[PDB]
From a paper:
The HIV-1 Env is a trimer of gp120-gp41 heterodimers that are heavily shielded from the host immune systems by N-linked glycosylation and further protected from neutralization by conformational masking and considerable sequence variability. A glycosylated region near the base of the third variable loop (V3) of HIV-1 Env forms a supersite of vulnerability that is targeted by antibodies originating from diverse germline genes in multiple HIV-1 infected individuals. Here, we determine structures of antibodies in complex with HIV-1 Envelope for all observed members and ancestral states of the broadly neutralizing HIV-1 V3-glycan targeting DH270 antibody clonal B cell lineage. Here we used cryo-EM to visualize the interactions of a complete inferred DH270 clonal tree with the co-evolving virus Env.
Based on these two early intermediate resistance features, we selected Envs from days 358 and 526, having both G300 and long hypervariable V1 loops of 18 and 28 amino acids, respectively, and Envs from days 836 and 949, having both N300 and short hypervariable V1 loops of 11 amino acids, to identify structural hurdles to DH270 antibody interaction. Despite poor sequence similarity, examination of the V1 loop regions of each unliganded Env structure demonstrated a structurally conserved hydrophobic core and variable hydrogen bonding and/or salt bridge formation that ensures coupling of the V1 loop to the V3 GDIR/K motif. The d358 Env V1 displayed considerable disorder in a portion of the loop with flanking hydrophobic and salt bridge interactions ensuring the loop remained closed over the V3 GDIR/K motif. Visual inspection of the V3 GDIR/K motif in the G300-containing d358 and d526 Env maps suggested greater disorder in the broken sheet structure compared to that of the N300-containing d836 and d949 Env maps. The d836 loop displayed a kink in the loop near the V3 GDIR/K motif leading to somewhat greater exposure of the motif. Together, these results indicate a shared role of the V1 for protecting the neutralization sensitive V3 GDIR/K motif that is mediated by a conserved hydrophobic core.
Numbering used by the authors:
A (entry chain J): 484 to 512, 532 to 621
B (entry chain E): 3 to 106, 116 to 418, 431 to 460
C (entry chain H): 1 to 30, 33 to 91, 96 to 107
D (entry chain G): 1 to 52, 52A, 53 to 82, 82A, 82B, 82C, 83 to 100, 100A, ...
E (entry chain F): 485 to 510, 533 to 619
F (entry chain B): 484 to 511, 531 to 561, 567 to 620
G (entry chain A): 160 to 212
H (entry chain I): 116 to 159
The structure:
């Protein structure tokens, strides 16, 4: 539950609490009524597998950060570094970029393929 | 000063407990031709060839404290119950029966019974002419005339028919570890029931144990490779069970003469009862043949084995202690129909003239009895009925072990009787990470 | 064949004393102890040679490894008068009793 | 609450059939093994009876072979002790009993009301 | 074969770690297989996840930035290398277990600064 | 479905689009009838986990196993331009277990370090 | 007269709300599988197909 | 006030033998039972 503490703080504090959020994300603690737990387990495992797979498709597993090789457009967010880093809180920034969600999703499979033209 | 690391693939163990799953061969709809105990869901084929001997693997075993045998017993009882779930319910039969003995030692054992029954038209009645075993019918209150009888069960519980194609002898079925788990097999022949084992081997999946069913004796089992083996929780704790595992088998054959015939009896729309219609032959009752005085020889070896562990309290043998009929008698289901035998002749005699003596004279005979209705697993209330089978029924088996108490044959538990086989094996899980310098 | 000889046969003690009863075995096993008040159902007191049973205070204690086992009852309460029986799973002895001095 | 309830005693002539019933009140009778013992004034008390009520397994002590019998009825949850050929020495209080846990079949936990047996010599 | 490594000291076992990892992966009455499959998959996923959290996936062994202390173990290089069978060392470190767990998270984060 | 477009093309064009196949490979009361969707998903997840496991045991990847020409002597240009994937896949499939093996040893030779 | 069934087997009623015409129902490949459709109109029941979608 | 709320009921029932019948002597609360059509006597 400490990972939610970063949700209640600015960017810098969350910068170190990334791993604690990652740890809990995988797993936790006549009556045939209870087997819906298996549905939940399968769905959670699938979500985690989607995360790892997608990290794979950036070619950026292991790390949480990776130097990915693509342009950036101010149309998605023109606001400066300091506001986005210092004052900001995560939910608001996520909502802001969420308007451009599929406008900030797409290419970088091709970027991986681009640096894979020689890999 | 040497700083931290993580191995992966460390070969170490933790004594975890989990739900095993089996593997079994299959050939058709009812698990090869007909089914009771087999289950194709336990997949073919036998993965037992994965075997390996291991160096310096000293590990403890405990067959008394084994738990996977309990899971296996739960599996068998659940499978047997759901097998009988779709079959017919014999509730309509429980009506007054005007009955007598046979028409004309002998099958005066049989009680002739006539009774009313409904046709396929729900409101029309017809009489019947049926035969039943004496122990499967209770006479009504003796203040009324004793000629009237009823089925035993309906004073207490319901009844169910055994489906015809659901009939099967025990199959060798292998219990296999899931991924991440492994099975450890002790290989020392002198295993004392529990303790360290040094020649331990490991297998992906284990031996195909047969779910055999028999009281007071172990039959169609796997012989020991040392001489006759003794296993017990604690011998001096006299009132607990002692188990004996034979190194050499002994043959028993059971038969009843007669070209006996059954007849289907329509009872309401869409189901039929299977009553015994007639008996045709000399039909000397259910005598079983033992392999001559090889029993006379074998008791000598068992007596010597027992005497090895204890001071000179002279060993001898005695009839069954008593109690319920199934504990009083050796039981088995070889012919589909259930058999029971008074085992007095087996354990009679005490002296060296027939306990340090050997010869081959003639097969020893056991008086036996037949039954249909049965609470299958040792009195638990799965009150069900098995139909009769055509005449000239015969069986063959190899005896492999015995049950005894201490200061008489014991009754035993079928879970315990299978645990006598599963002593070889143990369950464990893997823990793949560690550290070093 | 008495393979559990409780000794001494009986003890006459005033309240609050420390009663000691020895029991000698000759076969490996578990030495528990019974007690019944006069005309009352028995109760387990000591189990496994030294361990108190449920609902039994610290007054009662026992030992030891070996063939001889020494029951002890400190601070003798008058309600603890009556007969005792040295016992283990397949064995119990003749019995001994404690009374007022 | 698990409890063992005993029926009334018997004050009958020697050389007679004697019968006692004990019910395991408030418990799954079929699962746990009961036992019978004797208690009398100044007597080396004795172990009488065994009963594994599931299969009805039974065994007897040395002095009791043939004379002593018992059976069980799972529906009534009652163990029925019955002695044949009563004699003067049989005078003792009889307890239906149980062990501390249903893991080992011995009797040092529970005791009934001690229904007495008295021989009218 | 990985159980063969269990019956040997550390050095010989060091050449056979991969095969253990390879095998580690893989009538309503018959439905019970699903629980075993799900639990085995979850154990494997926990392994890969935690390998991620050390920052040490892909590699089987990783240079991970926490030191050792004599309290957790004082016994030297030679004993653990040569004489030492796996289960005994595993039991010895298991006396500590959770304390010898913990800190590498902030060391992953130290390299992640 | 684009990856099947690469199926209908030779090695060169398909080399540009291997990732889309990986992306799609992962995922896409009275009626207990439909419960077997769960075990189907479990089997698909297990296939994916097997793929990742085999990728891990190897440590595109500069690996070190050689290649006997007996399994295929056909030259460079054929298996770039002319070759459609199914044909070469079938060609090497004859030697399948003959060409399954020593990548574990390729891991092991570098596990010497 | 009598009902035909009871000489052979039992009977069951059809529930009122359980009544339905054939709906167009699609059939979807699970993950890792795919469905191949032939487009050649002259398909002879079995054989190669060239315009496969 | 009193258990006039309770209604005494006697009725026929089958034994364990499916064809035999016996009478009974039972008690039920008023709201758990209903009389038959009042054209017949209300005792039923």
């Amino acid at each position: 539950l400490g990972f939610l503490g970063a949700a209640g703080s600015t960017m810098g504090a969350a910068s170190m609490t990334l791993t604690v959020q990652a740890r809990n994300l995988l797993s936790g603690i006549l009556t045939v009524w209870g087997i819906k737990q298996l549905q939940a387990r399968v769905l959670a495992v699938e979500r985690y597998l989607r995360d790892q797979q997608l990290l794979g498709i950036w070619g950026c597993s292991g790390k949480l950060i990776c130097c990915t090789n693509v342009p950036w457009n101010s149309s998605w967010s023109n606001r400066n570094l300091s506001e986005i880093w210092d004052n900001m809180t995560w939910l608001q920034w996520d909502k802001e970029i969420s308007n451009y969600t599929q406008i900030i999703y797409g290419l970088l499979e091709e970027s991986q393929n681009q640096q894979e033209k020689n890999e | 000063n040497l700083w931290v690391t993580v191995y992966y693939g460390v070969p170490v163990w933790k004594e975890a407990k989990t739900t095993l799953f089996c593997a079994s061969d299959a050939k058709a709809y009812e698990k090869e031709v007909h089914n009771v105990w087999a289950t194709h869901a336990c997949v073919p084929t036998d993965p037992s060839p994965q075997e390996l001997v291991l160096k310096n693997v000293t590990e403890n075993f405990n067959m008394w404290k084994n738990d996977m045998v309990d899971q296996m017993h739960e599996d068998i009882i659940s499978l047997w119950d759901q097998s009988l779930k779709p079959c017919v319910k014999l509730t309509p039969l429980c009506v007054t029966l005007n009955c007598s003995n046979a028409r004309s030692t002998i099958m005066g054992e049989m009680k002739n019974c006539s009774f009313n029954t409904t046709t396929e038209i729900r409101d029309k009645e017809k009489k019947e002419y049926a035969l039943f075993y004496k122990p499967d019918v209770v006479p009504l209150n003796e203040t009324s005339n004793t000629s009237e009888y009823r089925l035993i069960n309906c004073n207490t519980s319901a009844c169910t028919q055994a489906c015809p194609k659901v009939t099967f002898e025990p199959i060798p079925i292998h219990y296999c570890a899931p991924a991440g788990y492994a099975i450890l097999k002790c290989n020392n022949k002198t295993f004392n029931g529990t303790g360290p084992c040094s020649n331990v081997s490991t297998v992906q999946c284990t031996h195909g144990i047969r779910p055999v069913v028999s009281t007071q004796l172990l039959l169609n089992g796997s012989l020991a490779e040392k001489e006759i083996v003794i296993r017990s929780e604690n011998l001096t704790n006299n009132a607990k069970i002692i188990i004996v595992h034979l190194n050499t088998s002994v043959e028993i054959v059971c038969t009843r003469p007669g070209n006996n015939t059954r007849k289907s009896v329509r009872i309401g729309p869409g189901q039929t009862f299977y009553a015994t219609g007639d008996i045709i032959g000399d039909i000397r009752q259910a005598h079983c043949n033992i392999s001559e005085g090889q029993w006379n020889k074998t008791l000598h070896e068992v007596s010597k084995e027992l005497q090895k562990h204890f001071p000179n309290k002279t060993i001898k043998y005695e009839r069954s202690a008593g109690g319920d009929m199934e504990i009083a008698t050796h039981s088995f289901n070889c012919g589909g129909e259930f058999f029971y035998c008074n085992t007095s002749n087996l354990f009679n005699g005490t002296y060296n003239g027939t306990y340090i003596n050997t010869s081959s004279t003639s097969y020893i005979t056991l008086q036996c009895r037949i039954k249909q209705i049965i609470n299958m697993w040792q009195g638990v209330g799965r009150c069900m009925y098995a139909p009769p089978i055509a005449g000239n029924i015969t069986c063959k088996s190899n005896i492999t072990g015995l049950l005894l108490t201490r200061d008489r044959p014991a009754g035993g538990d079928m879970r315990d009787n299978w645990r006598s086989e599963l002593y070889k094996y143990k369950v464990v899980k893997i823990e793949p990470l560690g550290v070093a310098p | 064949e008495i393979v559990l000889t409780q000794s001494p046969g009986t003890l006459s003690l005033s309240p609050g004393e420390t009663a000691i009863i020895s029991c000698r075995t000759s076969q490996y096993g578990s030495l528990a102890w019974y007690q019944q008040r006069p005309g009352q159902a028995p109760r387990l007191v000591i189990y496994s040679g030294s361990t108190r049973a449920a609902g039994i205070p610290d007054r009662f204690s026992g030992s030891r490894w070996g063939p001889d086992y020494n029951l002890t009852i400190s601070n003798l309460e008058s309600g603890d008068f009556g007969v005792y029986y040295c016992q283990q799973y397949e064995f119990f002895g003749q019995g001994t009793k404690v009374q007022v001095d | 609450q698990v409890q063992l309830v005993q029926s009334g005693g018997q004050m009958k002539k020697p050389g007679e059939s004697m019968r006692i019933s004990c019910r395991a009140s408030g418990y799954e009778f079929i699962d746990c093994t009961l036992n019978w013992i004797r208690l009398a004034p100044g007597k080396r008390p004795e172990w009488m009876g065994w009963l594994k009520p599931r299969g009805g397994a039974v065994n007897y002590a040395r002095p009791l072979q043939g004379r002593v019998t018992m059976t069980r009825d799972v529906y009534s949850d009652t163990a029925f002790l019955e002695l044949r050929s009563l004699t003067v020495d049989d005078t003792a209080v009889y307890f239906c009993t149980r062990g501390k846990n249903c893991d080992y079949n011995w009797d040092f936990e529970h005791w009934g009301r001690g229904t007495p047996v008295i021989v009218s010599s």
